[model samples]
Structures are given as structure tokens and as C-alpha cells.
Target: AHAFWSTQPVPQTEDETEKIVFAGPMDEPKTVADIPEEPYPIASTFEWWTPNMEAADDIHAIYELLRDNYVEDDDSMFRFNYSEEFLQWALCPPNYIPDWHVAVRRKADKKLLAFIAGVPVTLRMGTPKYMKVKAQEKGEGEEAAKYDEPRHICEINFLCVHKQLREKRLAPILIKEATRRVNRTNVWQAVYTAGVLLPTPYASGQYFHRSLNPEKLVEIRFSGIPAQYQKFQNPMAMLKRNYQLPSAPKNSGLREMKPSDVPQVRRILMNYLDSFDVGPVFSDAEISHYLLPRDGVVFTYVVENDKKVTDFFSFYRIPSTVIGNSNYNLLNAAYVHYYAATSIPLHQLILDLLIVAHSRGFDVCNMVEILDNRSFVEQLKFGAGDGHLRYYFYNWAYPKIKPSQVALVML
Candidate 1:
């Protein structure tokens, strides 16, 4: 009933009819917490639960709503699209029985009607969390370690909603349901949910397919649609589509990386993080486990004259399970996850990959975390949504800090 149901303190807006619309709502905590599997009378059905997508075939029926309403894509700065995994992590409220990956769906009449994939993320509170501890803290701060309860802050992951339902505001309904369930748990003292694309120029590029129905999007809180998401103003792959690349026999050598390439790529990324530095500095072990030459080849590229390995990138065709039994990979999405490099010229090859990908049937080329290299990241729609922000317990803690990022807790 208090602040928890209103999606923080974002300004609320009204339609011409003066109907109250919210960027998000935290207004129905009680109803959300006690939703029954099939509450009768339609109004009686309020069982808020998830982590399943079994009956969602009907839910994903219309892509037109997504395409017709989004207005930001018509603008200049191109924004990338959203991934199902990314959305789930951003909005799934904590306190559900399983991890966000587990609790994210509701079956209604033999159909998965709700989409609730949220990842509960936590920010480590110590020097190790940063690439290099800021100069201020000489030694590790002992008091900053433990994450005890009844404190001031906690974050709300799954702060996003991507739907195909045409009628009554599903996002607010979902938000209300999430709040009802979470508030009743008594796990969080004060909750914190955030908006990634809240109509702020600084907060763009959080979504692709911006040419959507603004009327439907117009209902919510925080910021208007553009601040919440964006897409390419002028997609670059069109150049590649027209065969607009260098034709003078560009012989860029590419090789599948061995186990040894792990340290090199990790150091390169870290130096880039330390120097041009962006995103969280990941540990070498993480790279070894994730990036080592396994089934997926770690593709490294180099130009002849540039003595050093000009650039690095990794790619592979993963088994993708989309829309039930459906499957596809990045090749068809028409985008790459990264284009991180040092040399400007070699990076051209990175852009080249997109043309190739789009040709191979990908929807578009992709990239993010423009913090390290703006030229490429921005080209693909950097500074997009607040996927990085919106963690729990912001206002609860003293001298509160809205966590810099979020992730789904794997239970």
C-alpha cells in the first residue's frame, strides 16, 4: 500500500481521457502474493507465481504490437533489441520459490499467458569488486563484506516487461502482481526497482524495434518510451547489404583460438578495462571457464602490417530454443555481442562481420557496454536501457547506492 507498489518515485502521467498510467506499478502487493493457480470468477484469480514458459505459444502470437508502437527507432541513435533472458533478469521480483530462471510463468487455460523471467543480481561490497580499488581505500574494507538482512537496501530484478497482449495494460498488472507477492514475503525491508529507458536522453538504446505503438507504451511510469529503449536511427548493415565493403582482396586472417588464448584475451580486456575501462572486471577464471577454446572457437583476427594481434572476438552457433520447439542462433539475429578492439582500422573487420551475419540471415548486428570503445558500441546502440541499474534495497540502506548492475540468481 505504501511506496513499494509505485515503481519508486517516477512522475506519473495521464492520458487525454485523464486515465492514470504508470511506467510501472507497485500498487497491488497483497493480491500478487496470494495468487491462486486458478482463482475463480476471473477477479478471484490472483495467484502470482512463475519460472515456466510451457504454455506461451499464444502469448507470443502478435509481434505487430511491438513493431507498431515503439517510436524511438525512428530517431538517430540506433538501439539494440532485448533478449528474453535479459528481460527476465530485469523484472522477476525476488521471493519466488525458485531462481528467476525457474519462477517466470503462469499457465491459464493450457497456455503460458505470463512472461516473468527475472534475474536477482547482487553487487559485491568490497575492493575486489572494482578493477582497481579506488585510490582512497588502501586496504580491503572488512566491514563491507557480509550481506545481512533487515538492513536498508535490496534490489528488484526483472524490472522489464515485453508483451504481445493487445488490451488492458499487462505491464502494470504484472508489476502489481510482482509487488503483491514480494511485499508479503517480508524478506526485504524496503525494495528498489528501476527503469532502464526512462525517457532521458542519457538513457537510450535499451531496445530494438523502436517503431512500436506509442499509445500502448504511453501508459507507464518513470520515463517515456525512448528513455526506456532505442534502436538504430540508420542501421549500418544496409551499406553491407549493398555490397559496400572494401573489395581490394581484404585478406584478414582468422584462426580458432587454442586454450592458450585465454590469458591474452583476458589481459587485453582488463587493460582495456583499466585504461579505457568499462563494465565489471571479470576474473581470469571466469574467462577460462567461459572463453577457453571448447566447442566454440575463439576467433581472433589480425591485419598484416599491424604486428600485434589487431583484434579479438569469439563466436559460435549455440543451440537456441525460442518459442517452444523453435531454435536459432546469432547468425540469424544479424548482430554480434561485442566489437572490443584497440586499433581503429582492424575494427573495420568487426563491422564487416555484421554485414556477413546479416547476409547469413541474422536480424541485425549487435553490441553494448560502449564504455570502453564508443565508436563501435554507440554504432550498435550503446547507453541503451538501465539493464545495468535497478537492484534491490536502494532506499533501505543508509547513504543508499542503487546497485550499478543486476543479474538473475541461479537457484
Candidate 2:
């Protein structure tokens, strides 16, 4: 029995799938006044805490917790190592609520043990008639006509617990506490992804990886030669030659995104995302915060023509710790974040992205089978990975969407 999931607002079983007539919130309408006024209870030895994003000590604490005990591969060979700068960019987005960064600490010495963060986002899905009527009654004709399909929601991530506390069932309490924090802000829906299958999923996608340093991958036992290629006289040489790239990007117009490009970039991004059934609707400020070039957090480039920005692409750096490798302690990985193409071909844009990533010393470039990425996977030599990520929405009900229709990417 799924005791915890059975009580949640998510859809239960396949038997009830036929009863969903419309796509919307599954829970009854309620206000912040109806929510609990205090944090959920924890063990007497532990206490609830909130980390101050501006303080270095708090950020380090969260980083240590995730670095040692966060997500790992099935073989236990790699663990995510999120840096301090990446944490700040991910947690402190526009309109971020301080209390939503829920943490657990030991009362004896105040050691940070667990954490879960919720960031604000505007998710757009299928349009329903009632939402349009409500928009019209608010006397916002222009705003409604522009795009009235977004629902303000929270994006939950970085749920981590100490290795010693896995048997304590602290995960369920952490989730409930995070929900309480989010509900207090008057937001009723959330989106998250997991490696394991949950009670329900709105969409599912497979991870693909393109090797930039095939030699290093094989040395660390992260990758192996395919059966077909094993008979080659020199497989390592063949692998290297197969994944080789030019020293520089072919697109001369592509350059780093700047603050002045926010307006044009936001317009291009919004127009491209309109074709997807599930994606984020970003504001100008959000675009600047998310897409602008940050030293090690994110890298974004735009194709400019006569001072007019036509297309853009971005990827974030999230290195993974090589568990016991003596030569390499970390594997630098660049994950595909967001992109929109109008003037340049999608495959060509991504190829340039690969070149840029390779020149920056990245060992691998990882992407999911989402949006328009299918067009370039085979042509670019991206090998299918074993990992599968499932997308889930809390307290909301909607029809299942295809990987090509999903445009949202969570850190």
C-alpha cells in the first residue's frame, strides 16, 4: 500500500483515469488562511531550519549535505556535486520566498541534515474555458489576449537527507513540510522530477550523453566500447576520432548573452515555447536572471544579425564526483538547459553548442529527449543513457504529455 501517496492529491490508479474531464487543480480551492501556521513536527533530537541564502555559512552547509548524500547513479560510481555559486543561482530566483528553503538540523550541534527548496515558476498548460472567463471578468483584455494560460506554481528540487537518516522516513516529512511552506505562499501546485517511478507522472524522458572526452570516460569505467566496435584493431582511437570536433564554434554570430539582450531574448523564447503544451512562461527579469552569462553557473549564447537577436541557447555546469578514481576526482558535465531557434537550424545551433562545451574542457554533454532535441541526437553522436527521468505535478491533474511537448528543465 502506498500510504503516503494514497493521501496526496495526485491521481491514484489507472482505474480512475477515465474520470478526468478537464485539466486543472485536483484539490478543492482554498486560501492561505486555511493552511497550518507552523512547520511540521520532527523528531525531538532534530529541528526545522531555514537557510539564509545571502550567508556563505548556510550555503556551504546545504552544499555539504547534497554533495555527500544527494543523487547517485545506479552503480554508485557518481554523485552530484553542486557548487556554492550554482546553489545561489538555483535557489534565489525572482520572487523567491525565503521560508521555502526548508532544512533540518540536529538540535545537539545544529548540523544540517536535510533540505528541500521550492522556487517560483509560471507553468502553462492546456487552456480551459473557465480560466478565460475569469480573465475577462478582471478587466484585463490586453493581458488576457496576450497569453492568459499560465498558472503560478513552485518548482521543488534538491531534496536530500543524511546517509544515516535514510531509514528514519524523514523524506515524507520533508515533502509535507515543503508543501506547507509552499501553500502558505498561496501557491497550490508544484512540479518535480525523479529517477524512480512514483504514483503518477505527467511525462517521461530518457537521458542522452555525447562524449567529449571518450578516453577519460572509458578510463573511469563510466563508458564502454559498444559490441559492434569491440572488434576494431584500436577501439580507443576510433572512439576518439568519432567524437572529435573543431577547435572553435562554426557560428560566428553566436556570442555570450548580455543584460541588454533580455527584452529580445524573452520575446524570442516566449514565442518558441508557445508551441509546447508544458513549459515555463518567463518574464523579462526572469530571462535576465536565468539566461544571462554567469561565470560557472550558466552559459548562454545568442545569434545576432545587425544588432537584432534571432535565436539563443544555454547549458549549465553540474559536475559529478568520481567516487574512487585516483586520477580524476570530478567529471565535468554540461547539461542542456534551454534554447530557441528561428533563424538558425536547430541541429546546427546544437552542434555549435557542443563545440563550445568541448572547448571549455567539459568531459561530456548531457541532454534529455525533450522539446526539439530528437532532431539532433543521432546526427550528433549522442549515445542513449540508462537513466530515465519522470516528470510529476503535485496537487494538479492533467493528461500525459509527450517528451517532445515538454520544455521545462529543472536544475
Candidate 3:
């Protein structure tokens, strides 16, 4: 099934997995000079573009292309409708490489029809003893010693092709070109997630949804009351009551995260993520860039008990347009980003988070079944969603990891 992936540097089915070799780079290591300087060739009618995120016209074209033809469910019920500001925040990070925001357009009219991006990240993952030993051998003075600590990888996301060009196989071209660009940067490893299964998966996570607006969801046919709720005679009313949340967070110390808490938050988050087998390692700058509070964009909070950080959690806003519906134009969705709770119970930590998200305008809160989330997802009343997301690596390989082992949240 994966004819093209099989030829690439990615892990294979039976042959690669059965060998049980330590997960690491499959291709021979190469210097930046080894990679071709020029971008990969596209179809005669199509050309590549790296639109400036700051330019209103260029980014709008990208937004339009994704808004109309990006990810949609199996039934075409709802589509991910990311706002332009959200796109800017996701793509423009501390060390983001502008050329990595690859786009394809019709040469005639300069219409953006396809897009993919690579967000720079320093990721740390558990690897086989062989790779660990090799890492130590590369160590030099204190500076080189730090690089040996963990692996640096690119987070590839937003790969999309126009529906009209589906048969042209532009997706493979996008993947290869992005890989080439990443390789030229001397980053040999990359990570991405897909709804569709490919050659192999490092981990698989189930989607969980906590509805904040049951009535709206039911009206849009996105969700409905379960059969048992019908016993109450007023099924919608019963469902609504079941999903009600507190008006305010019960944790008195809980407050919106501030710039001063960045160091503590980073320490807590990094220590917590290290417990997992797979997770992205965020630098101090990366932490501030991603976790800082942004109105209508991202929300982060920390439990400051007696002036010391006790726990923390955060989620980002991503609204979806309700298609064919005149009642509402947008369905506000908040996806759990990262959290750590050492002093409080995990479920209690989630309860406060749910409360805060609801207090805001978010219509629904979503999370993945990863990083000890299984212990609290059901307790917090988050029902299993219809889809599952599969995580993958471009050129690197690692031992298979469980849902809880995956600590990354790809926007």
C-alpha cells in the first residue's frame, strides 16, 4: 500500500520492524553540502512558494485554500477552520525556518492550491542503547556535551492539496520537497501525524471530546444525546445537565500564566515530559513562544499555591466552521496542549481546566489519549471521539510506543 514510503528512508513493514534494530537514522549521515541546493521540481503547471506570513494577501490565500480543502471527517460533517492569527502563531515561532512553509500554486494565476510546513523543535525521545552510546561518543567540551543530551527534529504539519488536484499525486511531491528542505538544514529527523495509516506508526492516540455546548452540537448534528438520556423524557435537557461545568475554577491559586512563570513552567513541564518515552523538548524560548497567553488564540494557567508553582495546564483555540448551518458560523474548540500536576490529583487538575475552558467562549474541549490522560479522560466526562490520530516520523525510527508514551501535540 505504501509504495512511495517504502522507497524512502522511513521504516518498513515486516523487514525493518522484525529486525528489532534500535530505532535511529536509517540512511547514512550526510553533511549539509550533500543535499541538493535547489528545490524539487513540480508539475509544469504548478510552482513552489514560501509566502510571507506577515503579508496579508499571501497568508489570506493560504487560509482560503486550507479553509475550503484541508482536513475533513469521513462523513464530511465538520472541517478544521483555523484562523489566520492561529496560523501565524503556529508557523511563526522562535527558530522557525521561513522556507519550510512550502506552498504550491498554479503558475498561471499564482493561486495557492497546496501547502505544508515544518516548525522547528528540539525533541527528546527514548532510543535504543546503540544510539545512546553513539550520542555520548560525539560529546566534546561543555557546548558539544549539551547537543549529545537529546535529538533535534522538525515538526511537519499542515500538509494539504487542493481537492481538484487529488489525482495529480501532489501530496507525495509535497512530502519529498519538505524532506529535502529539512535535510538541507542538517536536521535528519522529523515528526508528523496523520489520520490515515502509512507504513508504520510510532504511537496511536484516540481523540476525546468534552462538549461545552451540547445544544449547539446537537443542533448542528455534530453530536446528539445518547439513547439512555432519552429515558429522561427531555433528552437534550438531560444531556446538557450532564455536561455542565463550574462557572469558575475551584483552585483558588490557579491563575493565568504570566511571563515571570516561564522558567518554573518550563522546569515542571520538561521534568514531567521526560517521564514519557516520546515527547518534544522545548527550549526556554520555545516554551515562551508556545505557552504564553494569547487572547482568543491560546490559554495557559498555573496553580500558584503560597507563591510556588503547584500544577499547570494549557490549551489552544481552534474553531471549526459549521457547514450548511445558518444558526452558527463557528464552533469554538479548545485542544489540550500540555500540563503537569505534581501536587494535585490528575483528575482534579483536569476538572479545573475544564471549568476555565468553559468559562471562556470555547464550545468544546478536545484531548488525545496520551501522557497519563487515560486516568482522567473518562472521569472528566470526555467521551471518545469518532477518529484516531496516528503519529509518524519522516526519516527516523524508534521502538513502538503506547498512547500514554506520546507526549507531543502537533497543531
lDDT tens readout by residue for model 3, 125-150:
54633444554677523322233357
Indicate whether candidate 2 or candidate 3 has the larger lDDT: 2
Prediction RMSDs, each to the true structure = 12.1, 4.2, 3.9
Q: Which sections of candidate 1 miss by over 4 Å?
A: 1-49, 52-98, 102-108, 120-196, 199-243, 246-253, 257-260, 275-278, 284-310, 314-331, 342-346, 355-359, 367-369, 376-411
Candidate 2 lDDT by residue in tens digits, 188-227: 9899998888878877899999999989998887898767
List the global CA lDDT of all models. 0.33, 0.86, 0.83
TM-score of 3: 0.93
Q: What is the lDDT of residue 382 in candidate 3?
A: 90
Deviation from native of the Cα of residue 247 in model 3, angstroms = 0.7
User: What is the alpha-carbon lDDT for the whole of candidate 2?
Assistant: 0.86
Residue-pair clashes per candidate, as listed?
A: 77, 0, 0
lDDT of 3: 0.83
Off by over 4 Å in 3: 128-148
lDDT, residue 298, candidate 1: 25
lDDT (tens digit, per residue) of candidate 1 on 212-298: 112222222212444223354533233223323332323455443445656666676556544321123445654454344332222
Residue 292 lDDT in candidate 3: 91
User: For model 3, where is the 10-residue window of minimal lDDT?
Assistant: 140-149
